Design a protein around this ligand. Sequence first.
Ligand SMILES: CCOC(=O)c1ccnc(N)c1
Lengths: 237, 300
Amino acid sequence: GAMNSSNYAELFNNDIKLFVDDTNVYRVTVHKTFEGNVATKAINGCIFTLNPKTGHLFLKIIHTSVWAGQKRLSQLAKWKTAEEVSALVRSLPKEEQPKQIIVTRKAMLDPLEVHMLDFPNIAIRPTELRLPFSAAMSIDKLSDVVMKATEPQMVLFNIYDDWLDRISSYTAFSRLTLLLRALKTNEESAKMILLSDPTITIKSYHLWPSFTDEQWITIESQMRDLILTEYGRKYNV
Amino acid sequence: MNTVPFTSAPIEVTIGIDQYSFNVKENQPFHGIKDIPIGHVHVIHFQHADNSSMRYGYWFDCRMGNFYIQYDPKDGLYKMMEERDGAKFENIVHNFKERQMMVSYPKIDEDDTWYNLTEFVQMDKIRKIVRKDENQFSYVDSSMTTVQENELSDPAHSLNYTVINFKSREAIRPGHEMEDFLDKSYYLNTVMLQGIFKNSSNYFGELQFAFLNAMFFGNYGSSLQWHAMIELICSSATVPKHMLDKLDEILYYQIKTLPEQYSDILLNERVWNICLYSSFQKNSLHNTEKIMENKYPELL
Ligand SMILES: CCOC(=O)c1ccnc(N)c1
């Protein structure tokens, strides 16, 4: 059944699992036409598929060409997500295939269940957690590869950089969701925090800056402050 | 006309014959039911006055033999049986009529209700759902489970309904996942109609039979089957025109016949609202939609 606050630590056991998030698959800008009607223009998207134990991110880039001539794109986007996740699973050796796939939005359950009928032993699960993975496009290097793509493409990342050399996967996921929640609540301030100090750089093969243990504690504290603030700035408290 | 005689009525029981029913007192001088229309299947059913648990009964066709009822005090129920000695059977029936010990199947001449509820039902196909090959009639009761229910435990005593499962490889063609799940026409027309039933009459026959077991015995797995067969048609964009017209007539009479007070358990809100308001066939069931809206507007 559903993943929630009470079975949180199952994410860090030794059963392979993937989170799937489809919130950035179908993306548009809305604008006015010369006649003063409204129209959408699609921009490139991505499926966010994450192993929370290892940090491996399977970033499937959705090129706008996949929408050409199609109707009901928001419904199609859920099925295209399921089709790509199923193709990914089939591409993996049996011993790397997940035992569970956790979708971040309930609307993905039926599409994914149907595409995965060949894998009856893979559990498709929803979650009650309000995870901030929509903010993945606030990571500059992820946004950059999606926007530059000229064709469909899969790109592989470790979203934890080298953190697992020093911290556990539980702590690494807690850090990741804190950063992403901050970026979702106030992107500009969150990005200012992460990059205000020019002496701390992002390695070419990493996504985040090379903070020491002590600097991550200060960073993490600053992101909590930001989130709490915006919560007042918003609800006025 | 045909007759189903009763050896006796030793325990107080409510007796049903098709959509009719009457009460019989413990050891009342009751010897059966006469004037039963030939040409239709029928169901004779029972609810003991002492145990409203377990409604149970027998589907039969008068053309397939001479059948009678006899209470069994060991197994504690009214059992259907076949009399092979035809002479013995006419002699019995004639004596019981002469003494006027029988109730008359009470059909109004204008009244086509039973025909309209059983139009497509075949009795030889019913013996496939309720497998007991040594009898020509078929026992059903409230508690019997379906094959599909046993998958999700005694197979001898199960309802072998056609397995319908919308999230199954039978239902979904590789490479047409979204198409086949949102428009089930392939599954209705090719897998089920052409592949299993052979024709639409067999589809309506099982659908009519499932409904009647749900209504007369409160059989939960039968209600599931009735709603699934409805939903498969309503969720297909391409259905023969004659099938939709006939489905509308079928459902109309089922809704008309349902007890007003059982609507809350025999009717699945989700399927009906889909069929009448969201599905491809939302504008194709004019008679069913009108009786549903005038009789059970609460469900909608
Ligand atoms: C084989 C499942 O049942 C049927 O196909 C059936 C049931 C009742 N009447 C008819 N005509 C057919």
